[PDB]
């Protein structure tokens, strides 16, 4: 007779579930044609090299592959909390054939697209380079997409993070079913190396104060912290030596993360368009914070280009009430075999634990992995490798140069780490 919250069983737990979804590219002039230079504006005049209705290579996404991808999603039978979503939804054509309002009536079909699939889902965007016309040109102060993703976005988001968003395209925002749990969207794009509006800014938009400011908030608040942007911070590893950000900044933005190492308790990005890990490290390699690039839901490529991947969406198991991130599951769609008979069979590329024997996702756990791919014919890298392109290519190989630049990336995100593996390791 006395009102105590009821008690529940002695069961574990349930592990929380979120989902990563980005890089959408939806391309509307997507058609099947005889001519198959018209299939698709965003292969810029190619042809398209065996086009269905999902899509083709050297396209970005038909709308009927990105309605598929959050099916899948919403049929999957996983029980999740949230979803992050760290942007790109225009695609790659000219900037001629964009503008403003079509790069924001882009964004208003994806972000439509997923409220009215998932209505009671609180979903976290991030803005990506391609979410701004011109492309990469993101600006410090308030702008018609910034406002205009304010209030797409407003659903999702409250006064404070609507405000910043407005101003900067960055905002952070409580988790309203994880309490203790706040996600910081950043505007990575802010740093990328195309971006003229941020040429000789030290601290463009006060995005870096304002992170400092978040933090310092959340670490004497006892949160826990998820990052999300579009960018990564690091190296490609696919290329010697180049940061994914301006090397100015992405120095900057990682000594930010190692002070707060202990509050950050995941890092999650897209941009690249493949499937990668990073550990972030101190100086002595002492592992710190755990990274995830997310793929692409669009295949496309380049004609350059050898390799794509197949589309992507993924999956984290979290600790709840503590935020410490358990699994990675990736799922993936086989983009021949669905053209071939018309239907998508959106499926699980792996889960990380089961994978590569892990325990869990710790920086300790994953260190201890990517110091395994450094060996000599490393089964765990050729997998990882493998994983990299979605499945695209089990034939794929990555020779002694492309394996340096790999592990180099994985393991070494700051400049002064990663020329010393180059030095120790070409
Ligand atoms: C996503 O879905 C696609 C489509 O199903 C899968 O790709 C197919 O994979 C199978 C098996 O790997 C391929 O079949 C094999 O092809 C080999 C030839 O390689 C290329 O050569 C021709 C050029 O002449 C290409 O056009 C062709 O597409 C291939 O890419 C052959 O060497 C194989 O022959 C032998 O294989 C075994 C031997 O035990 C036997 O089954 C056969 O009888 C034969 O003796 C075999 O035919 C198939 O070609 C692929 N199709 C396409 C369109 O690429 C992906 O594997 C799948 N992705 C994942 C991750 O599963
Ligand atoms: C785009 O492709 C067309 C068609 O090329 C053919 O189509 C494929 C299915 C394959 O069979 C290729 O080997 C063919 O060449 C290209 O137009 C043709 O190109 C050659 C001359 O270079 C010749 O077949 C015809 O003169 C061209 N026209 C047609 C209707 O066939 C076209 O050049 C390609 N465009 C680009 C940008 O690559
Ligand atoms: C989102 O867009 C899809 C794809 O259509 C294109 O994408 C938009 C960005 C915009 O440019 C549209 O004018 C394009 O047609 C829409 O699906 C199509 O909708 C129209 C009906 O208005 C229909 O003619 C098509 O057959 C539909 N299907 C496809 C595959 O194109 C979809 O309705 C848009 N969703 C929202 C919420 O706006
Ligand atoms: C980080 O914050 C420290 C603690 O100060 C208190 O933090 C919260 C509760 C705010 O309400 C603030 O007003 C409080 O005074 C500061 O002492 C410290 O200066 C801050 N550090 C940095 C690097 O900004
Ligand atoms: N694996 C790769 N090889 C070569 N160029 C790439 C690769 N991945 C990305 N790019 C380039 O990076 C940009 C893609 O990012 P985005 O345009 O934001 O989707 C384009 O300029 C691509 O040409
Ligand atoms: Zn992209
Ligand atoms: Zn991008």
Same mark, same amino acid.
């Given at each position: ?7 529940? #069983? ?11 979804? *980005? ?14 230079? @018209? ?33 899948? !999603?919403?049929?999957?039978? /996983? ?8 942007? =790109? ?25 997923? /409220? ?22 993101? $600006? ?9 993703? #304010? ?10 993070? !609507? ?30 190396? $195309? ?32 990052? !999300? ?26 000594? !930010?993360?190692?002070?707060? %190492? ?43 280009? @050898? ?14 009430? =503590? ?7 990736? &799922? ?11 239907? %998508?069979?959106?499926?699980?590329? &792996?889960?990380? *634990?089961?994978?590569? %024997?892990?325990? =869990?996702? /710790? ?7 990517? /110091? ?6 490393? @089964? ?15 034939? #794929?190989?990555? =020779? ?8 180099? #990336? ?17």
């Amino acid at each position: 007779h006395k009102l105590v919250p009821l008690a529940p #069983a002695d069961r574990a737990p349930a592990v929380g579930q979120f989902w990563h979804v *980005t890089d959408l590219h939806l391309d509307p002039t997507y058609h099947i044609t005889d001519d198959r230079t @018209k299939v698709c504006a965003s292969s810029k005049g190619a042809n398209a090299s065996n086009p269905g209705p999902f899509g083709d290579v050297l396209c970005d996404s038909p709308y009927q592959l990105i309605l598929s991808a959050f099916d899948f !999603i919403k049929n999957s039978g /996983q029980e999740a909390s949230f979803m992050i979503w760290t942007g =790109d939804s225009p695609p790659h054509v000219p900037v001629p054939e964009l503008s403003t309002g079509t790069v924001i009536k882009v964004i208003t079909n994806m972000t439509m697209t997923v /409220q009215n699939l998932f209505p009671n889902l609180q979903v976290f965007p991030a803005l990506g380079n391609h979410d701004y016309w011109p492309q990469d040109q993101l $600006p410090i102060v308030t702008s018609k997409v910034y406002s205009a993703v #304010a209030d797409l976005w407003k659903p999702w988001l409250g006064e404070e993070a !609507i405000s910043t968003l407005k101003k900067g395209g960055f905002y952070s925002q409580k988790v309203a079913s994880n309490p203790g749990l706040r996600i910081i969207s950043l505007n990575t794009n802010l740093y990328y190396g $195309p971006n003229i509006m941020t040429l000789n800014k030290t601290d463009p938009a006060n995005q870096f104060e304002w992170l400092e400011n978040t933090l310092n908030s959340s670490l004497w608040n006892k949160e826990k912290v998820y990052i !999300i942007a579009h960018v990564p911070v690091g190296y490609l590893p696919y290329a010697t030596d180049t940061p994914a950000i301006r090397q100015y900044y992405n120095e900057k933005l990682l000594d !930010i993360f190692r002070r707060y %190492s202990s509050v950050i308790a995941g890092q999650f990005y897209g941009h690249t368009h493949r499937d990668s890990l990073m550990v972030l490290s101190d100086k002595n390699g002492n592992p710190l914070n755990s990274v995830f690039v997310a793929p692409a839901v669009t295949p496309v490529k380049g004609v350059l280009q @050898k390799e794509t991947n197949n589309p992507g969406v993924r999956l984290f198991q979290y600790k709840p009430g =503590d935020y410490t991130l358990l699994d990675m599951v990736q &799922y993936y769609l086989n983009l021949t075999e669905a053209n071939l008979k018309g239907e %998508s069979n959106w499926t699980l590329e &792996y889960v990380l *634990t089961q994978a590569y %024997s892990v325990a =869990d996702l /710790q920086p300790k756990s994953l260190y201890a992995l990517v /110091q395994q791919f450094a060996t000599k014919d490393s @089964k765990q890298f050729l997998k990882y490798y493998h994983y990299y392109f979605v499945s695209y290519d089990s034939s #794929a190989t990555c =020779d002694q140069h492309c394996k340096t630049l790999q592990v180099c #990336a994985i393991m070494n995100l700051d400049s002064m780490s990663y020329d010393d593996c180059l030095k120790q390791h070409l």
